Design a protein around this ligand. Structure first.
Ligand SMILES: [Zn+2]
Lengths: 369, 126, 54, 286, 204, 240, 121
RNA sequence: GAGUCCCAUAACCUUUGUACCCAGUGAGAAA
RNA sequence: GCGAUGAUCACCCAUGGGUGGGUACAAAUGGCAGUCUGACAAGU
RNA sequence: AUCUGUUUGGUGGAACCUGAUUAGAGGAAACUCAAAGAGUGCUAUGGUAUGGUGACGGAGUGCGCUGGUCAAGAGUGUAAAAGCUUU
């Protein structure tokens, strides 16, 4: 007698009622072993009486950990106390079929009138309801069971390994791989801005060569002016007002358009150095020893070209591409930097002190020469 | 480890050789003798004349394998499981099985000859 | 299509007659007729190791 | 799984009887959800009681064998346990009654000084014993009166008895002229059936738990299943490998038949040969 | 970008809704994927850079569509009959392909037909094969309306009328920037496209 | 290194051969644009313009399953729509190749017990969404019986002496009937007192005792000394 | 569980250090952390010994991940000074590796130590 | 009549300007 | 007051220059490199 | 080149010989008509079919049943116990 069946699953708990017992003595035979594959005969054995779904992925992860380490959770207590009849504790307990021989003791600790069975009969009843799944439940659950399985497997694994998204080096991979892209984008866009303003006067790109400073000053100068007080951010500003007096190049709609283009260049220019500050901060919280040793942008490009903090860590020290005496300080800094990246990757929440010591060692080595 | 068959057991009892002690002083090594379920089926099918042979094959020192096929043809089972794996000595006295086993290479063959066991295709016996 | 088979029709002949390109290479005996669906692709050696397969 | 929980070198001679118990100790409490109990008598003058670790419930988590050793002065030949109240009975040179607490027989219940070859307790009206003695005798005992009740002498020797589990006063004897006899306890002057189709001495008999058919293994190396109202064999099971079937039981499913032969093997059979054990849809069941 | 600027987080998505983005049928899919997902939970210090990138590419597309407005304006003020015939960005990459507007105007209509497909053209001339028929003019809306071999046919008639309108635009002096010659040429191409989409090679 | 190969479909579905002057076992790339363990890649331009899709070289000296494929196995059960339960997903080395052989419509459950390999498994399963990483001991399948349901093939690259019990437990829980059981047996890690043929014969006997019918074994000798792949199917009723 | 987890006790430590000294005499020992990771990614290594008391510990904890990837036994000796002294060099070493060789006169000893540290691990 | 949507919106070569060069090894080094 | 947490390992002058081979980036109204056909077709 | 005549590739397919097949060998079309095979899908669910032929149903009562608690009995144990067992 195997009277009830408890199937745990990511969407919730299910209590089934066993209608017909399968054979005990003929349980290894061919027809008994493939009646759990045929669905038309498995539905003669198993009937669903209850399904308590979870409150969400949080309670799903809680009950996944409790089922994993063999404990009865509160939702288990609720559904078992709803479904199982108040049998005696000394004479003919009610029989629940589980799949976990160390979850059984936790069930009898809470309900002493329940004896729990997980032997081969309960095992193949359980794998019958696992094999059929969504067909037994008659349509009563929200959410596809495999989609909840993907979510619960990823959540369980990240919990079990303590996956932190603060010390997640893919952020600094994508940050520096995007920062190089917008380096060349601000470069080519301000080159075209300088080209389109080159026939308004071709000396602003001679006095003010930096792309952002040129673009922000030409975003507000559109004419002659004189009144050269708020154009110092003043020898270069005085020379620029002198050149505006001696203007020596040649609209309205085109000039409005190149104003929109220079505003685009300014927006790219202050999204860069927001990103740079972000990745220096993320590099201090992800790789503090590397950034103490060779700097945040250099360590960022180092772990980008390595592919991950783990790949830079597990790489050999003689095979690190960092960027005579000048020839062998590269090798010294390489193997100290590999050491620092190993410290920084495999320590769990790192300090800065070993990056400090290795910086002291490499400055002692370079000052020795 | 040595796979026995039925005429090897019958010739062992007819020549008064113990199985594990005859194997040990033939090879000068520690032997594990194996009765497959088809060899055991053949000894049981031999009838009540061979009760002595059947309950000498029932011996805790003789371990026993579990063949998974239909029928009880021990020569087919021994040939298949020896040419699959080449980690077996075949102890037999059937002329046909002796010819099969000594035609497949790398398989030593043991047989009751005289008053003790002999071994042929094992090149390290002394 | 035949329009692309008429562009890669020569190196498929080279792969068919691999065995007589180098006098020291000596492949194992297959026939290798031209497969019905193929694709011509270029090896990306990455930016990790230099100078060896580069 | 067709595999032994445990084996036991129990005695030195033949283990001549064994049965199973739920031992009602009045100091300990029997743990029947994780231990099974079998006791067994042999010709080396011992009855031994063993416990078995059983994986059938997963409630718990253990000192398996030989919890006690009853001791007689002469050999034993049969044993059967009462289905309550800690009691069993052993036949041998004389038939004794025992309980699992005391290390000595409670009572000797022997008709005369003629030995006893077999024993069965009743299954309902559990206090009625029956026994086969080697003077071709079948004796009934009652345990209210703590005494024998009535015996009959037949032509040849009764090898075994089994009581009808559904009729409580009928039993079947299996004896050495090659047939079985269905007897009423209230009138032993006539058998109420004879099951005839064996050709050598019938070694063991057993009832279906439905009480509707019997199984009957004999010294010709074959077993036979009989409908209880007919008197000839409904079915014969044989095998070239099976020799001299000495023990037959009818499993509590009423669907399989366990036979123990004397080459060593214990074999399962279907009681209905053409019947498969899958669950059936209503079209194939109809 | 607009949806991650709107919500940010998955539980935030569970409490918010949106209809101005992601129209009316992907909402249940994003809500179900918000409820069950193999995705982690981000922090605020990198949600801030995610939001900065999202507003960055939103403003990028704003600049894209306003540059397209500028291109449409300069094109319909420089060569407006080509805009009325083949469209703004198609005529724009015609002019940008051939260099100057006068250098495109002094080219025959067959060149304006095959103008984009030079490598196919010159391989199909330097071995004796069949030349292309579409070129850069394949992405005109009229050739989009045609179907079969008559998109080669109206690529030809569209290049002829586009040569007419284009050299009118480049060589006129009393031009009015009003689309008149391009519009009558487009009416000619449209009723020609009608009369060769009305025929059918089946037999009725 | 910058050369050109021709990609050709293998006999096995989902895996390919790149013929050059040395031919390569090759799989499609599920996460295009990066390598996972430093293997080389092949980028084809298949024909809206054509798209650059790419392929990854499967290294038989760093993958027992690739050593089995290119030694010649009559039937892998890892197939392009299937579910594979990888046991002993020791890093993302072979699990990536099994993952993109199985494809976007199939699932690979990568079970591993150590934690730094688990961290690399999760960071690889981000860019390969068809990998469910399960950080748990495979000797107790009940501890993750809630996360996996009804796999089609089990692959076992565990290197423990209780291998056959681990394989049997995971198969009886999650494998379906007549599903695939691919085992990589390492003789020296099972036990080194006996020879390799003795331990392979014992492991095959253990599999058929746990009712997994072996179809095929391969020694995979030029890539690994004293290894084996045993391919069986989970018969569940009637190995006979 | 510490980071340097599968540490050996004193008898296993001295067995390990004796076979390390003999392999260092027989030119079968590659000593040092980056030589050890070089021979580990090359595949010529039978087991790696890390010392569990160097001044950082992640400096050699990079190696258990490599050993796990390639299924190589790894064991933690509790003295870098004694490990260097066994290696036969005049400095402490923090990691060493026994390279594979079949013309090696200590193959039985190396296999016995491999079995002991693998049943430990 | 007629091979572009399969990068003439491209590829390669040449020249001109800008920044560099001409990994493994594995116990020595210094006096 | 060392070290395995790593020692070590193209042409011309009495740190500095002269001359060029490869690397990337960008440019070129530099090159390859040359802008299809030409009178019928559809319907009744 | 009114030199050359080998190779590669296409076209062609005599004689002999070998193998297979034979109301000669095919091909194209489909919201065509039939004959069969394999796999997959679908709650595919009466272990003996509704709560009830006024012979019935509902309400209530009485008997029956379940669980824990307490008390009593009895066994066992013991100096006394305690404890444990009790269809
Ligand atoms: Zn066999």
């Amino acid at each position: 007698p195997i009277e009830y069946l408890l199937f745990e699953e990511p969407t919730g708990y299910a209590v089934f009622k066993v209608k017909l017992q399968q054979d005990d003595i003929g349980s290894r035979l061919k027809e008994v072993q493939e009646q759990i594959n045929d669905f038309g005969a498995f539905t003669k054995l198993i009937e669903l009486v209850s399904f308590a779904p979870f409150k969400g992925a949080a309670e799903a992860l809680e009950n996944a950990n409790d089922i994993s380490e063999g404990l009865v959770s509160e939702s288990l207590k609720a559904i078992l106390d709803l479904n199982l009849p108040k049998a005696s504790s000394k004479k003919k307990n009610i029989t629940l079929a589980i799949s976990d021989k160390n979850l059984g003791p936790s069930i009898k600790e809470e309900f002493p009138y329940v004896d729990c069975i997980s032997n081969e009969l309960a095992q193949d009843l359980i794998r019958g309801v696992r094999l059929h799944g969504e067909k037994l439940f008659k349509g009563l659950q929200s959410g596809d069971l495999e989609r909840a399985q993907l979510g619960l497997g990823h959540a369980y694994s990240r919990a079990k390994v303590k996956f932190s998204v603060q010390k997640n080096d893919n952020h600094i991979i994508q940050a520096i791989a995007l920062l190089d892209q917008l380096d060349k984008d601000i470069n080519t866009f301000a080159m075209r801005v300088k080209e389109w303003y080159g026939w308004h006067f071709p000396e602003l790109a001679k006095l003010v060569p930096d792309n952002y400073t040129f673009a922000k000053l030409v975003l507000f100068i559109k004419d002659k002016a004189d009144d050269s007080l708020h154009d110092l951010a003043n020898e270069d500003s005085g020379i620029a007002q002198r050149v505006i007096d001696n203007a020596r190049i040649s609209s309205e709609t085109d000039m409005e358009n190149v104003c929109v283009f220079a505003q685009r260049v300014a927006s790219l220019a202050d999204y860069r150095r927001q990103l740079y500050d972000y990745l220096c901060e993320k590099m201090h919280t992800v790789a503090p020893n590397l950034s103490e040793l060779i700097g945040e942008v250099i360590g960022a490009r180092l772990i980008s070209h390595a592919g991950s903090l783990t790949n830079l860590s597990k790489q050999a020290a003689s095979t690190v591409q960092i960027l005579k005496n000048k020839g062998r300080i590269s090798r010294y800094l390489a193997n100290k930097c590999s050491m620092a990246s190993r410290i920084d990757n495999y320590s769990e929440e790192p300090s800065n002190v070993f990056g400090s010591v290795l910086k002291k060692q490499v400055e002692q080595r370079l000052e020795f020469y | 480890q040595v796979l026995i068959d039925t005429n090897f057991i019958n010739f062992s009892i007819q020549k008064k050789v113990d199985i594990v002690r005859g194997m040990m002083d033939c090879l000068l090594a520690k032997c594990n003798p194996l009765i497959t379920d088809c060899v055991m089926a053949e000894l049981e099918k031999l009838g009540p004349k061979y009760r002595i042979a059947l309950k000498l094959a029932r011996d805790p020192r003789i371990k026993r394998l579990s063949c998974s096929h239909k029928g009880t043809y021990a020569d087919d089972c021994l040939v298949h499981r020896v040419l699959q794996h080449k980690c077996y000595i075949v102890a037999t006295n059937d002329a046909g099985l002796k010819q099969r086993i000594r035609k497949i290479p790398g398989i030593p063959l043991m047989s009751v000859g005289g008053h003790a066991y002999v071994i042929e295709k094992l090149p390290d016996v002394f | 299509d035949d329009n692309m088979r008429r562009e890669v029709q020569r190196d498929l002949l080279l792969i068919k007659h691999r065995a007589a390109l180098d006098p020291k290479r000596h492949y194992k005996k297959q026939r290798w007729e031209v497969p019905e669906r193929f694709a011509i692709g270029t090896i990306i050696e990455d930016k990790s190791e230099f100078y060896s397969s580069r | 799984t067709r595999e032994e929980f445990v084996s036991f070198k129990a005695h030195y001679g033949l283990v001549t009887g064994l049965c199973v118990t739920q031992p009602r100790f009045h100091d300990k409490k029997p743990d029947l959800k994780s231990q099974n109990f079998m006791l067994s008598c042999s010709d080396d003058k011992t009855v031994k009681l063993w416990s078995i670790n059983v994986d059938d419930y997963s409630n718990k988590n253990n000192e398996e064998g030989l919890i006690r050793t009853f001791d007689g002065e002469s050999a034993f030949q049969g044993i059967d346990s009462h289905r309550e109240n800690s009691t069993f009975a052993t036949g041998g040179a004389k038939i004794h009654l025992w309980d699992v607490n005391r290390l000595k027989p409670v009572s000797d219940l022997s008709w005369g000084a003629d030995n006893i070859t077999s024993l069965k307790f009743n299954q309902n009206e559990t206090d009625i014993l029956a026994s086969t003695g080697s003077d071709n005798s079948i004796v009934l005992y009652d345990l209210r009166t703590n005494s024998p009740t009535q015996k009959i002498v037949q032509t040849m020797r009764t090898n075994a008895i089994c009581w009808n589990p559904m009729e409580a006063f009928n039993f079947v004897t299996a004896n050495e002229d090659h047939n079985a006899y269905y007897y009423d306890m209230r009138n032993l002057s006539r058998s109420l059936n004879v099951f005839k189709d064996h050709v050598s001495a019938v070694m063991d008999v057993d009832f279906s738990p439905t009480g509707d058919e019997i199984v009957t293994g004999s010294y010709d190396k074959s077993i036979r299943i009989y409908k209880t109202n007919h008197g000839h064999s409904r079915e014969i099971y044989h095998t070239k490998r099976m020799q001299h079937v000495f023990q037959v039981k009818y499993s509590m499913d009423s669907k399989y038949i366990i036979s123990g032969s004397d080459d060593g093997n214990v074999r399962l059979w279907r009681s209905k040969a053409w019947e498969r054990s899958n669950v059936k849809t209503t079209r194939e069941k109809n | 970008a607009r949806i991650i600027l709107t919500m940010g987080i998955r539980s935030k998505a569970s409490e918010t809704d949106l209809s101005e983005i992601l129209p009316e049928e992907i909402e249940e899919r994003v809500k179900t994927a918000a409820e069950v997902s193999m995705g982690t939970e981000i922090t605020q210090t990198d949600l801030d850079n995610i939001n900065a990138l999202a507003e960055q590419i939103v403003e990028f597309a704003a600049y894209r569509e306003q540059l397209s407005n500028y291109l449409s304006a300069r094109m319909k003020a420089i060569a407006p009959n080509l805009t009325q015939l083949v469209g703004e960005l198609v005529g724009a990459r015609l002019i940008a392909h051939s260099g100057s507007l006068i250098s495109l105007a002094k080219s025959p209509a067959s060149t304006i037909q095959i103008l984009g497909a030079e490598k196919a053209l010159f391989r199909a001339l330097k071995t004796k094969h069949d030349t292309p028929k579409y070129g850069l003019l394949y992405h005109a809306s009229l050739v989009g309306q045609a179907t079969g071999k008559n998109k080669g046919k109206i690529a030809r008639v569209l290049a002829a009328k586009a040569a007419v309108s284009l050299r009118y635009d480049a060589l006129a002096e009393d031009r009015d920037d009003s689309g008149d010659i391009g519009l009558e040429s487009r009416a000619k191409v449209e009723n020609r496209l009608s009369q060769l989409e009305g025929r059918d090679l089946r037999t009725t | 290194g910058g050369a050109k190969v021709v990609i050709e479909p293998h006999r096995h579905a989902g895996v390919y051969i790149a013929r050059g002057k040395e031919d390569l076992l090759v799989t499609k790339n599920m996460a295009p644009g990066e390598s996972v363990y430093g293997e080389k890649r092949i980028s084809v331009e298949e024909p809206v313009p054509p798209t650059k899709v790419e392929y990854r070289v499967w290294n038989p000296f760093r993958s027992k399953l690739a050593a089995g494929i290119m030694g010649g196995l009559d039937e892998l059960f890892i197939a392009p729509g299937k579910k594979v339960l990888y046991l002993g997903a020791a890093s993302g080395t072979s699990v990536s190749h099994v993952s993109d052989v199985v494809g976007p419509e199939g699932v690979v459950y990568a079970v591993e017990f150590s934690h730094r390999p688990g961290r690399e498994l999760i960071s690889m399963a981000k860019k390969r969404p068809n990998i469910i990483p399960i950080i748990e001991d495979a000797r107790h399948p009940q501890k993750y019986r809630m996360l996996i349901g009804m796999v089609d093939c089990v692959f076992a690259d565990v290197a423990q002496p209780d291998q056959a019990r681990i394989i049997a437990l995971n198969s009886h829980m999650f494998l379906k009937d007549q599903g695939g059981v691919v085992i990589s047996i390492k003789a020296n890690c099972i036990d080194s007192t006996v020879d390799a043929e003795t331990v392979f014969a014992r492991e095959v006997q253990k599999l058929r005792e746990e009712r997994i019918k072996p179809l095929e074994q391969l020694t995979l000798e030029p890539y690994e000394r004293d290894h084996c792949i045993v391919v069986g199917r989970y018969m569940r009723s009637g190995l006979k | 569980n510490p980071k340097a987890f599968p540490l050996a006790d004193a008898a296993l430590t001295q067995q390990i250090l004796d076979v390390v000294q003999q392999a260092a005499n027989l030119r079968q020992l590659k000593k040092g952390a980056n030589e050890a990771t070089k021979t580990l990614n090359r595949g010529i290594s039978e087991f790696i010994i890390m010392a569990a008391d160097c001044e950082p510990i992640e400096i050699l904890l990079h190696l258990p991940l490599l050993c796990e990837d390639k299924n190589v036994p790894y064991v933690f000796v509790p003295s870098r000074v004694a490990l260097g002294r066994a290696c036969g060099v005049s400095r402490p070493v923090i990691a060493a590796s026994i390279t594979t060789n079949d013309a090696s006169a200590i193959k039985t000893q190396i296999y016995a130590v491999k079995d002991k540290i693998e049943t430990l691990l």
